[PDB]
Amino acid sequence: MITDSLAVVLQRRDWENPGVTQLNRLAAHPPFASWRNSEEARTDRPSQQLRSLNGEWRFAWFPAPEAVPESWLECDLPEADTVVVPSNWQMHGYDAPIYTNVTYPITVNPPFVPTENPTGCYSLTFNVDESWLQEGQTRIIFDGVNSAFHLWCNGRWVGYGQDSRLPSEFDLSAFLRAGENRLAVMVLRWSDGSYLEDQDMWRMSGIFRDVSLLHKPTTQISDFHVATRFNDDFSRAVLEAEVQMCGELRDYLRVTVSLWQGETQVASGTAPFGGEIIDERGGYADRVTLRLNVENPKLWSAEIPNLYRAVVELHTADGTLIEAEACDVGFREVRIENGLLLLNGKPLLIRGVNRHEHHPLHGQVMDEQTMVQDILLMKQNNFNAVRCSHYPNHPLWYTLCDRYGLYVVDEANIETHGMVPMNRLTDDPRWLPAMSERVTRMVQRDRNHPSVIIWSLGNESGHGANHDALYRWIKSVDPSRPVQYEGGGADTTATDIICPMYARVDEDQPFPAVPKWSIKKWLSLPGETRPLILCEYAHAMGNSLGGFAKYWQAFRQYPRLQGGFVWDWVDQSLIKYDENGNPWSAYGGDFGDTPNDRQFCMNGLVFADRTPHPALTEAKHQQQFFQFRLSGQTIEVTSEYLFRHSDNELLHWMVALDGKPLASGEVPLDVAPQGKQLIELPELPQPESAGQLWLTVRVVQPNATAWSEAGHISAWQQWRLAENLSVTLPAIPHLTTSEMDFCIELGNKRWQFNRQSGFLSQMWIGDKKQLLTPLRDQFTRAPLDNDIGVSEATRIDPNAWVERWKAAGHYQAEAALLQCTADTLADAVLITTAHAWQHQGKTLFISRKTYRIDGSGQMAITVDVEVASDTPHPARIGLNCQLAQVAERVNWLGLGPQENYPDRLTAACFDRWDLPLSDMYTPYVFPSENGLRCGTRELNYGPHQWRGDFQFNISRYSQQQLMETSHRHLLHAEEGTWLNIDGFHMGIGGDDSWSPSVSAELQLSAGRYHYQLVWC
Amino acid sequence: EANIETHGMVPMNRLTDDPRWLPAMSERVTRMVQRDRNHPSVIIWSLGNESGHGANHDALYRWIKSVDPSRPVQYEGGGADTTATDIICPMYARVDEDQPFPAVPKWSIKKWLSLPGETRPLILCEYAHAMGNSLGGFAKYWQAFRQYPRLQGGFVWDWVDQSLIKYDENGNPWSAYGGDFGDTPNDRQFCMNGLVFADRTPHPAL
Amino acid sequence: MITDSLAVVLQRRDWENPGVTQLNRLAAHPPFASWRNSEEARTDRPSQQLRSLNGEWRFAWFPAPEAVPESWLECDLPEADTVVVPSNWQMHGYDAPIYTNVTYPITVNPPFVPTENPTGCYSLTFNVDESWLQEGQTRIIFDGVNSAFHLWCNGRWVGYGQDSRLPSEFDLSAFLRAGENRLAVMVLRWSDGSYLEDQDMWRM
């Protein structure tokens, strides 16, 4: 009882030693439930031998493990609270969460951690029946503890564990007692395992996954491997099951393995224990391999996730069942052949996304309802694969990916991004034991899951010799799955797939040791033969995903470009509450954590409550499984489905004339995997009116599926048809000139131009003013996250667009009135102006305008702008003003319902759209320029109408307030409505968010620009 | 050669195919390479001896090839031609006669070179077992080594007898083997396989 | 001084655990002598910074590590003999050497070894100058110990090692003192490292 004490157990300091990653922990294995009935195992009913210890626990926080009193090992602390488990303790306010990207949250001095190490003392009092203690084995299973822990059971020390993302199991058979038992668990926030856990995410701690008790017989199944081999046409498979047993070998022991396709038993095999001769000493007495033949098996894929049920029975020769286990089996073959990743003989096209386990309320505690909501949203947006960035997930995630159909990259919990250099640990043999436990225990847990098709060695840890060793371990133990790893340049000997992060389509990025070549160039470098799948691309931080269509054009054209995984799925924001209890989304330094990396945790396609960002519909369009070509009257549909026929798809088509519908119809799709269907439209309506005819098609699923509602739209496309230019041609407004203003009147309408500023300063409809701010040129935007270009908060890039714009005085440029005149035409008043924008005597821009007010009360505005070639190209070229009116609806003829930019508008459609005014603002958590719609020919708001060919955004927030506000909950609506009408608007970039990423064709570099707008 | 031999296990790779023994095994390989990599006389690394073929062998082979590409790695276990070795290095493969065991056949050295796919050199890690009055047929190996270019020799078993000195009742020393110290069970005179006696006096086979 | 005791150090039983092959052992490296003169290094003369501790040591044999009394950590046992180091203790008649080819000399039950585990308690009293302690680092280097051992320096526990054929080195800078120092080394015949050491040879 001296050796069970805290002074003894703590003094060796196992959390500051990479050579001790566990003590008395059991071997890793696939998920067990220990069914004592074969029918409960087959139907996956809940075993009575697996007890969840989740629920109310006692919890006490301590600033260091030395501060834990010795009485906690025997009795509950009076100062302890009662908390729910699983949970992170930072979500209950005991200390703060820390957001840091690359820089470690502790002092870099491995293997040591600080003396101030926050310690969470968990305890649970609970009952075990005597029947669990009279026979068999009782183990406790912690599915995830962050980041290291010692365990006591009834005041006796049991063991120690360190990987936060894999289960730790301990035998409690010698420690339990009939009646009352008490577990005490001491969780440390930091350890030497923390040096391998430097992912770009919130750093939390605690018992954040499930805790369970499992009872097994003394003679028990200890492991089982399922594999499926095929012939060349996939018409016959062999399910090879390898079972291992612990306990005492008797000759009456048998293992039966049955395969079930639903209720039909499809194959079965029985055998005594005894593997085949392995070497000179013989073979495994405690193992048996059962080979089950399967004729014409239904194949598993993400398109059709066909699953079987394998039941493994350990029984006696007289048919007495000892123990049953089971798993869902998916028949599929993953293989790289001739430079191509093949699934069931067909080359994949990976429509993937990276997904952290994140909940804005529960932190890193994952529940089945959140996982199911994520999977449906992903599949509804045409994703077919997920990368577990950057750790083994909750075990239910793989079961859900098996059932719904998503390919999965399973990734070991190793990231050492903060080291200098990045491979300082991974090239060191003294850390090879630690790293090997994080790879080998992941493969042992997850190797039976069909949805897992690729292993990953971790993320952003350079390239060391330990990576090459662990790659060869996985290839030896599990040849059925390729291994990939990005570190050290993404094409090392530790990966089977070239898997770069943020390699661009056409532009090379020649860094010194780790160049990011263009994806197209990288395939043809001499010697290179591997497929290329980006492990991260299209960094979706805020208003992003510009240039996303360029990737998908390249993926379809190049056979060895097999897709990639978008960064990333969900924003990593946390909910805080204001003084009146209103929740608001928080990021980086919002919890007092310093240093931190601010809004860089929020890179998602969806908000933290799983509401979609506008970029997600661009991804759904570019990733869609039907492609269309129009010839004249004939549509050519091509399926990108590799395995399924289009048996739940109906093609709707419509023709409209400037929003006005003219004809439409439906045709059922009937296209094979990778085939084509020709669809002949009827003789189209030839309208007499002027305007552009548009053809829109949409593929609709009439029947619901497991992941989609009835009527789900899965793909669409729009084309221009014939165009009829208008050759139809359409009292006298009075010009009253004073010294300060030009005032024009026409009936109840009046326009006033200020002669000192040169801008339209006011309009009247009757006695009602319409403008609160004048109508003035605008050359700037409230900067996006891609404009700001910061991944680490300590590093500012002078080549970023916001630094160049600020240093060039774009945000402070003052206009000088060069000319302002007025004249009376035969039927109109013409106002001519010219302004020059200057910063310290440098003329940035010149703007020449003419305002032409006719007799019908229309104001035709013509704008010609000159941009200095040595200033950085402006973010926009347009006009802005604050209208006095606040209206409920915005109606307009242009591209798409959602926010779209010139770099990201392929998913939007030309049509007449009508939305509430709050729908015209995208509430990004870090505020910025948002809500733009491009390609617009007409805009209606209140009594006003604008016509031309422009991009607009309209909101209650000025660009100045957007730039000056760090959080969206601090925004307040201004007095009127801010309108930004842009002749031209820069792209938004998004190849990455820490360097300039707008392509040169999306920049405003033409030097001279022209646009025209008609108000009324 | 790393200090790894698990000959007594059943099967021989029960530990070396187990990931829970991969840390132990890795320390025995990596600390040998770190100590000895500057020595010019060391031209080949070995992963140990008579431990079957496990996944840990393939991992530690790839570690050595990454850290020190200047030396080939060999390993005999699991049939002497696995993916854990750069050299076909069998023990007691005969010149012309095959020995077809089940999982680990000892082909004839000449036949082993021409099996389909095989391209590696062949150097016997043990051959010509010199137990007592032995080394019959030694000239047959050396005729084969000179004739076949990919037969690049081998290592005789072995140099010195492993006998220990005991003393009689009058203090006369005598050479002892196996169960001469009360150790039981033991394997008798099988420790004495040398070309020389334990006092380094040569046997006639030398 | 409770945690330096035999009852504390032994009770975790590091020799029956393949996940603990060392504790507080330094990184492996090529052979060092730390010459403070470039000409002595080039001509391979013997460095004054490398001291051989070979010679006469005190030795006591025990049938198991539990049988070691607690007073051995602080003072020499009166029953101890004086033996030369390096040496195998079976060549001094303390127990017998074992010749076995393939069959392990212990019960095959990894990672466990028998409770009857023959233990060799070595100790050495020796002097260090103050100049070694005033600055720099002092390490002890065991070039080979069969098959596993715990180490104490002046009654404080220093570490643990397991590979019998490679050097184990430990930093002794916090443990040494000017004048008289005493190392105590407890060598175990069998451990979980013995499962990887089944060569056809005498087991000593």
Ligand SMILES: OC(O)[C@H]1NC[C@H](O)[C@@H]1O
């Ligand atoms: O590998 C990923 O975790 C990192 N790459 C960029 C992304 O923002 C994240 O920090």
Ligand SMILES: OC(O)[C@H]1NC[C@H](O)[C@@H]1O
């Ligand atoms: O590998 C060697 O150690 C073994 N092969 C045969 C020889 O007698 C010895 O037992």
Ligand SMILES: [Mg+2]
């Ligand atoms: Mg540790």
Ligand SMILES: [Mg+2]
């Ligand atoms: Mg990182």
Ligand SMILES: [Mg+2]
């Ligand atoms: Mg050990």
Ligand SMILES: [Mg+2]
């Ligand atoms: Mg042997």
Ligand code: NA
């Ligand atoms: Na492709």
Ligand code: NA
């Ligand atoms: Na990030």
Ligand code: NA
């Ligand atoms: Na030759």
Ligand code: NA
């Ligand atoms: Na022998």
